[PDB]
Nucleic acid binder design. Structure first.
Ligand SMILES: [Zn+2]
Lengths: 131, 154, 342, 194, 134, 52
RNA sequence: AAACUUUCAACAACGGAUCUCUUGGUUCUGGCAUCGAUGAAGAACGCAGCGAAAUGCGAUAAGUAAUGUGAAUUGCAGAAUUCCGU
RNA sequence: UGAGCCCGGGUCGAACGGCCUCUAGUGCAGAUCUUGGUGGUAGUAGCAAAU
RNA sequence: GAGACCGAUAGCGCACAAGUAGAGUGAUCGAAAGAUGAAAAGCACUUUGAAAAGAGGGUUAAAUAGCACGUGAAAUUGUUGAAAGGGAAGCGCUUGUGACCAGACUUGCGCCCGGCGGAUCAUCCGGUGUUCUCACCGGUGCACUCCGCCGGGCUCAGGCCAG
C-alpha cells in the first residue's frame, strides 16, 4: 500500500479551454475567457455551432477537485520545513518544489521527501546523479 | 529523443557577412534566391551576366511586372529583371567568402552556396524612406564520399 | 578613442552617437589608406613584408598557457621534463595496471538506472569493438543494480572494462569508464567525463556506416600527467593492432581540456589541380606528401568529453583509502583563461 | 478566553497559518498533531493539548499542555518518553491522555504510528543508498555552463580537427607506420611517397 | 538613529554629495586603514592616502600584493599602486585602479603635516578613553 | 492636497482599543501567534524588578 | 514535383515593450531676509594647448589677492612646479 | 467552470513572493482615441516638391 | 529636512545640449532624447576590400554585453523544416494520419529461526536540569524484557485497463 489514498475515479467534464470569441482572428485579444456583452452576439445568445460558455454545471466533483492524475493534491514547498508539514498527509498531497528554490535546497527537499514518503512532482530539475 | 541536423564543420565552411548595405531589400531577396544552392563559379558568372544584361534573375515574391523576355525561359517564369546593384553587392560578398576560404585552406573550385539569407536593415531616418538590407552567406565544400572496405568474417 | 569611454565623458546620447559615427568613418578611411600605402611599398620592395610578418604575429591562448614551476595535479609538460633531464615514474607506480601488454579488450556498456538512451548507448557500444550493451534495470519496478555489483559481475565473466552512460533530459550526459583489469588485481581507476554536444551519425550530413574493422587511434595534444592517464585509459579500451585494410580512425583530440571525439573513414587520394599541398606543423609545408591528400568521411557520433573525476576504485563508494579520489574538477581551476589541466 | 483566542486565530491572523488554494489550510506550529488548522488541532486555541514529537537522537516523546502552566510559556509542555515497543507506546498514550478529548487520543496514536513508520522507512532508504552508492549532486551553475559553452566554440575553432586528422594521417604515411606495402593506400600512391 | 536636524538620511542627497564632491572632500572619502603594527605604534585607525605610501591590497583579485602608491586618482575615487598593471590589446600596461577601502597602509610618507594629523587623532582617542575610564 | 488624510477617532474608542491590546498581551498564546519567539520567558506579563 | 499563398516550429532580423535602476520631478514642513546710478535683472563680444558643448571669468580674462587644508590636476601633450614646505 | 494559478526547458543578471489588514492615479478591442513602431498597397504610381 | 507621491509615453515643457533644437514678420509657439562593463580591459595583430562592412585572432565571468552597447515582447520580415491549397479563410463536436514531447504503484509491512550490538532492561551505582516527577549524561553487565542489524524461510498487501 505505497501509492495515493483510495479515491473515486477522476472525471473531467471538459478538457478543452474556453477560448474567447474572435481571439483567433485578432492578435490583440488573448485566449483568456471574456463574457460577451452584446445583445446579438451569437456566443451570448447560445446558438449552435458557436463557442460554449463557462457555467457552474461544468464544475468538478468535490471529492476529486484540485487533484492530480495520480490522486495527490499539489502542495508548493519552499524549503525543508514545508515538506515536514506533509508528515501526516503523505498520501493526500504531493510536494511541488517552487521555481525559486536553489539547487542545494532542492537536494535537502528531495532527501527529506523520500524519507517522509511524499511524492515530488519536480524531482529532476537542477539535479543529477553521481556514481 | 530527436537530434537536430548538425552544422557542417567550420573546417569545411566559410562565412561572409554584409550588414547595413544600401541596396533595395526586395531586389536582393530575389537575386540571392536565384543563386542559392549553386556552385560559386556558376554564381559569379551568372551575376556578371546580369550586370552585362545577358542573363536575368526571376522575380517570384516581389514581382513588379517590369520585364518579360526570353530570358525567363531558363527559369520558367514570366517576370525577369536586371538588378545591377544587387549583383554587384552579392559579387563582393562571394569574393569575400572565397578569400575567407582561401585563407582557411579550402578547395576553391568545389565551394557551393550552402546557405544565403537577406534580412531588413534599420530604416534610414531622413516622408521618403530607404530599404537597406543585411546579407549573410555560408560557403561549404561539396560532400566527398570515400569508399567503404569489405567487412571481415570472423 | 581607445582610452576614454564616451558614455562617461559625454552626458548626452545623441551627441555621443553622432561623434562615434564620425569616429568610425574617419578610422575606417584612415585604416584603409594605411594598408593601401603599405601594399605598394611592399610591392616595390618585398623585403619589408618579410620583416613585418615575423615581428607581427597573432596572439594565441595556446602560446600564452601557464605551466607550473609529476603528481597528477601538476600542470607540467612531461615531454619538456624529459628533455630538461636530458639536458613517468610517479604515474606508473600509482597506476601500474594502465601503464606488460594489455590483453584483447572486452567492453560492457550500461546506462543509468531506468535509462531511456538505449539507442545512444548502443551507438557508444558500436564505437568500441568487442563491446556489448546490456540494459541496467530490465523493467521499471525491478532490482536496482549498483555499479560495484556490475563491476564484480563483468570481472567474473571475463570483461576488461565497464562504461556507464548517465542521462539527463533523455540525452547522454556523463561517461563513466571503469577499468576492471584482470586476475587478482582490484578494479582500477574510474574516469568520469561529461558529454556536452552529442550528435548521432544519423543526423550528420554526408555520413557513413562503420565496418567491423578495428580503428586506429589518434590521441592528440596530451602532455600533462593527467592527460597521459586519459590517453592511456582510452588506449586499453581499443585493440592494440588496428585492421588497417579498413580505413577507419577514432580521433580523441584535446583542445584546452575539451576532448573532441570524431570517427572518420579516410582515403589516400591524389590532389585536384585547385587543391593545395598539406601545409604541416611549424608553418612549413610537409615533405614527401606533395600532391597527396587524405579525404575524410564522418561515420561516427560527434561528442565532446571533459574529464571531471579520477577515482581509485569503482566510484566514490568503491574507493577506500586516503587517496580515494585522485583528481577532481572544481570550477576554480578555470578562473584563469590560460591554465589547462588538459 | 479559549474561544476568544480561537476567533482571533481563525478569522484575523495567525503566524502559523499557511493558506493553500487546494481547499485546506495548514498550521506550521511544531506542536500540532495534524498539520491542518482547525479548532480541534490548534494548540494555541486549546488550553489542554497533546502532541507526539521525535528527537534528533531517535526518541519519541509525548507532550502535555495544561491550563495551569499557561501563563508560563517556558513550562508549557510536560515531556514523557514513549516506549520503543509499539504496543506499549500506544498504551502509554492511552493512560497518559486519559480523560482527554478523543480527537487528541486518536491523532496522537496516528502521529506515533507515522513517526515509527518513517523511522523504519528511513533505515531502509539509507541501507539501499549505501548499497547503490549514488548521490544527487547539483547540476552545472548557469555561469559555469555559459563559460564552457563559450570556450568550447573557441576550442573547436582552434582544434581544426579535419586538418589535424589529415596532417597526422599523412605524417604516419611518411614515417612508415603502416610498413612496407601498406594496406591503407593503393600501390601507385605509395610509390609517390618515395 | 539620526537625531540632529542638520543631517539627512536621504539616498538621493547622499549619492549626489558623494559623486559631486570637491577634491578636498574626496580626500577624506579615500581614506585607508593602517596596519596592525601601525595601529599599535601611533594609536590611529585610518588616514587619507598619499602619493608615497607603501600599501598592501586585501580585497579583489590582486589580494596579498604589496606595493607603493603611484597616483591618487581622486576623480574616479581610485588609487594606482606599483606593479599591479594590466596589459591592453597593444601590450601597453595601464595601471589597475584599486579603491582605498580595499587596501591597508604598510608604510606612511611622513612630513610635518602627517605627524600633526596623527597627533590630532591620538589626542582625541586618548582623551575620550580617559574620559570613559575615569 | 485637500484630501482628508487624517481621520478623527473618538477618545473613548481609542482607550477601549488600548485596554484590549493590554489584555491581549497578558494572554500567552496570542503572543506566539503574532510572531514573537515566546518559548523561554517564565511568565507572559514578565515583570522585571525596577532595581535592575 | 517546384514557384506563389496559408498555418506551425528552430535560427536570424526590425522595433523598444516588460523587469530592475535614478546626481530628476512633485508635494509638505522648518530657520532666515539679502538686487540696482558704489550701475542691477537681461543682451552681446571675448579669455584655454588640443574646447567641440556646458560651466567659470573679464584685456589682472577657465582667472589674481588673503585664509584654511595639506600633495595633486588628469582623455592626451607640464614644469628643474612644489613635499619636515608661507 | 472561469478570471486566472503552479511546475518543467531556454534566456537572464539583483532583487522578489505567499497570508492577513490598509490604501489607490488599480484590469481595455473599439472613443474617424493619444504617442511610438510596423504592414499590404508596392519595387506600383512616377523622377513634380523634398532628399 | 521630509513623503503610504511619479519612476523616463510617468513625474515640471526640460533626469540628457532645454526654454535647447526648430517654426513664425512679430507677439508668441516649442519638442525628441537616460542604462556597455566591476574595471575600457573600447578588439593589438594577420587577412578581404573604399565600409557606420567581413573572416581569423584577442579582452572579459560573459562580447548572441563591441560606444547600433542591461533585459530585448508584439506587430512586421528572411532562411530552414513539415503539411496543405479546383471561385475565401478562420471557428464548434468527433475521430483518424504524421511529427515532436512527457512518462504510469513513492512500488511494502508483518511473522518465524539463529547469531551480533545496543538500550527506555537490572528494585546496579554516581551526576545534571527540572514543571518535583519527570527528562538527560557517565560507568556497569545481559538473568529477564524490548529495539535494531545481518543470513535464511514464510505471509499478505497493493496503481490502471480488460474478460
Ligand atoms: Zn491554527
Amino acid at each position: 500500500m505505497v501509492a495515493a489514498k483510495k479515491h473515486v475515479p477522476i472525471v473531467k467534464k471538459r478538457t478543452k479551454r474556453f477560448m474567447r470569441h474572435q481571439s483567433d482572428r485578432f492578435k490583440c485579444l488573448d485566449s483568456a475567457w471574456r463574457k460577451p456583452k452584446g445583445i446579438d452576439n451569437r456566443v451570448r445568445r447560445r446558438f449552435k455551432g458557436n463557442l460554449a460558455m463557462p457555467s457552474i454545471g461544468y464544475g468538478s466533483n468535490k471529492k476529486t477537485k484540485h487533484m492530480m492524475p495520480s490522486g495527490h493534491k499539489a502542495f508548493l514547498v519552499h524549503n525543508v520545513k514545508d515538506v515536514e508539514l506533509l508528515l501526516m498527509h503523505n498520501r493526500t498531497y504531493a510536494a511541488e518544489i517552487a521555481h525559486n528554490v536553489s539547487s542545494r535546497k532542492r537536494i535537502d527537499i528531495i532527501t527529506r521527501a523520500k524519507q517522509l514518503g511524499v511524492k515530488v512532482t519536480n524531482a529532476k530539475a537542477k539535479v543529477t546523479t553521481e556514481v | 529523443v530527436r537530434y537536430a541536423a548538425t552544422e557542417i564543420a567550420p573546417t569545411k565552411s566559410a562565412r561572409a557577412r554584409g550588414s547595413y548595405l544600401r541596396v533595395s531589400f526586395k531586389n536582393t531577396r530575389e537575386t540571392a534566391q536565384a543563386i542559392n544552392g549553386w556552385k560559386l563559379q556558376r554564381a559569379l558568372t551568372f551575376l556578371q551576366n546580369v550586370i552585362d544584361k545577358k542573363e536575368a534573375v526571376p522575380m517570384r515574391r516581389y514581382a513588379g511586372s517590369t520585364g518579360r523576355t526570353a530570358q525567363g525561359k531558363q527559369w520558367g517564369v514570366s517576370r525577369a529583371r536586371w538588378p545591377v546593384k544587387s549583383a554587384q553587392f552579392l559579387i563582393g560578398l562571394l569574393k569575400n567568402a572565397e578569400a575567407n576560404a582561401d585563407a582557411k585552406g579550402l578547395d576553391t573550385g568545389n565551394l557551393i552556396i550552402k546557405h544565403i539569407q537577406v534580412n531588413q536593415a534599420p530604416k534610414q531616418r531622413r516622408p521618403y524612406m530607404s530599404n537597406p538590407c543585411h546579407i549573410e552567406l555560408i560557403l561549404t565544400e561539396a560532400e566527398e564520399t570515400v569508399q567503404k572496405s569489405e567487412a571481415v568474417v570472423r | 578613442l581607445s582610452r576614454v569611454s564616451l558614455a562617461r565623458t559625454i552626458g548626452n546620447k545623441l551627441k555621443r552617437q553622432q561623434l562615434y559615427i564620425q569616429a568610425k568613418k574617419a578610422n575606417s578611411r584612415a585604416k584603409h589608406e594605411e594598408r593601401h600605402r603599405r601594399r605598394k611599398e611592399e610591392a616595390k620592395n618585398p623585403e619589408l613584408k618579410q620583416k613585418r610578418l615575423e615581428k607581427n604575429q597573432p596572439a594565441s591562448i595556446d602560446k600564452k598557457r601557464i605551466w607550473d614551476d609529476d603528481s597528477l595535479g601538476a600542470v607540467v609538460d612531461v615531454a619538456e621534463l624529459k628533455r630538461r633531464r636530458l639536458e613517468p615514474d610517479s604515474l606508473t607506480s600509482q597506476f601500474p595496471n594502465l601503464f606488460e601488454p594489455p590483453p584483447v579488450p572486452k567492453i560492457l556498456v550500461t546506462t543509468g538506472i531506468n535509462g531511456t538512451i538505449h539507442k545512444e548507448a548502443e551507438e557508444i557500444a558500436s564505437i568500441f569493438p568487442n563491446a556489448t550493451y546490456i540494459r541496467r534495470t530490465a523493467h521499471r519496478y525491478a532490482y536496482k543494480y549498483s555499479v560495484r555489483e556490475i563491476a564484480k559481475f563483468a570481472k567474473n565473466r571475463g570483461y576488461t572494462a565497464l562504461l556507464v552512460v548517465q542521462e539527463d533530459q533523455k540525452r547522454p550526459s556523463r561517461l563513466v569508464v571503469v577499468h576492471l583489469n584482470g586476475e587478482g588485481v582490484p578494479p582500477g581507476p574510474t574516469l568520469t567525463y561529461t558529454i556536452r554536444n552529442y550528435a548521432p551519425g544519423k543526423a550528420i550530413p554526408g555520413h557513413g556506416r562503420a565496418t567491423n574493422h578495428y580503428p586506429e587511434l589518434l590521441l592528440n595534444n596530451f602532455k600533462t600527467p593527467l592527460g597521459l592517464l586519459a590517453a592511456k585509459s582510452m588506449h586499453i579500451l581499443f585493440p592494440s593492432k588496428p585492421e588497417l585494410a579498413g580505413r577507419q580512425v577514432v580521433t580523441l583530440h584535446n583542445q584546452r581540456d575539451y576532448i573532441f571525439f570524431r570517427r572518420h573513414r579516410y582515403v589516400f587520394r591524389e590532389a585536384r589541380p585547385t587543391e593545395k599541398n598539406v601545409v604541416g606543423a611549424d608553418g612549413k609545408e610537409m615533405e614527401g606528401v606533395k600532391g597527396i591528400r587524405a579525404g575524410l568521411q564522418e561515420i561516427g557520433p560527434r561528442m565532446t568529453l571533459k574529464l571531471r573525476r579520477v577515482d581509485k576504485g569503482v566510484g566514490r563508494a568503491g574507493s577506500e583509502g586516503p587517496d580515494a579520489v585522485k583528481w577532481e574538477w572544481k570550477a576554480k581551476m578555470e578562473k584563469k583563461r590560460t591554465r589547462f589541466n588538459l | 478566553s479559549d474561544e476568544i483566542v480561537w476567533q482571533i486565530i481563525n478569522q484575523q491572523f495567525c503566524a502559523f497559518k499557511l493558506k493553500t488554494t487546494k481547499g485546506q489550510n495548514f498550521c506550521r506550529n511544531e506542536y500540532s498533531v495534524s498539520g491542518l488548522c482547525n479548532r480541534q488541532s490548534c494548540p494555541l486555541a486549546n488550553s489542554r493539548y497533546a502532541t507526539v514529537r521525535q528527537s534528533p537522537k531517535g526518541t519519541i516523546y509525548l507532550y502535555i499542555k495544561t491550563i495551569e502552566r499557561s501563563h508560563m510559556p517556558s513550562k508549557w509542555w510536560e515531556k514523557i518518553k514513549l516506549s520503543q515497543n509499539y504496543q506499549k507506546a500506544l498504551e502509554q498514550i492511552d493512560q497518559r491522555l486519559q480523560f482527554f478529548p478523543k480527537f487528541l487520543i486518536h491523532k496522537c496514536k496516528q502521529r506515533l504510528t507515522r513517526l515509527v513508520q518513517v523511522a523504519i522507512r528511513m533505515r531502509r532508504i539509507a541501507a539501499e543508498e549505501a548499497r547503490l552508492g549514488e548521490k544527487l549532486v547539483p547540476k552545472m551553475a548557469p555561469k559555469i555552463k555559459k563559460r564552457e559553452e563559450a570556450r568550447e566554440r573557441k576550442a573547436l575553432a582552434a582544434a581544426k580537427l579535419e586538418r589535424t586528422i589529415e596532417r597526422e594521417l599523412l605524417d604516419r604515411l611518411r614515417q612508415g607506420a603502416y610498413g612496407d606495402q601498406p594496406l591503407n593506400c593503393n600501390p601507385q600512391i605509395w610509390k609517390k611517397v618515395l | 538613529m539620526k537625531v540632529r536636524p542638520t543631517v539627512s538620511s536621504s539616498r538621493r542627497k547622499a549619492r549626489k554629495a558623494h559623486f559631486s564632491a570637491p577634491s578636498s572632500v574626496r580626500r577624506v572619502i579615500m581614506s585607508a586603514p593602517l596596519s596592525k603594527e601601525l595601529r599599535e605604534k601611533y594609536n590611529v585607525r585610518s588616514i587619507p592616502i598619499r602619493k608615497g605610501d607603501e600599501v598592501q591590497i586585501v580585497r579583489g583579485a590582486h589580494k596579498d600584493k604589496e606595493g607603493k602608491v603611484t597616483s591618487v586618482y581622486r576623480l574616479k575615487y581610485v588609487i594606482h599602486v606599483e606593479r599591479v598593471t594590466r596589459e591592453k590589446a597593444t601590450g601597453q600596461t595601464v595601471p589597475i585602479g584599486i579603491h582605498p577601502s580595499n587596501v591597508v597602509i604598510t608604510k606612511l610618507h611622513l612630513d610635518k603635516d602627517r605627524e600633526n594629523i596623527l597627533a590630532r587623532i591620538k589626542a582625541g582617542r586618548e582623551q575620550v578613553a580617559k574620559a570613559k575610564g575615569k | 492636497i485637500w484630501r482628508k488624510w487624517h481621520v478623527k477617532i473618538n477618545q473613548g474608542q481609542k482607550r477601549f482599543a488600548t485596554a484590549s491590546a493590554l489584555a491581549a498581551s497578558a494572554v500567552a498564546p496570542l503572543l506566539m501567534a503574532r510572531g514573537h519567539q515566546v518559548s523561554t520567558v517564565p511568565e507572559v506579563p514578565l515583570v522585571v524588578d525596577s532595581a535592575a
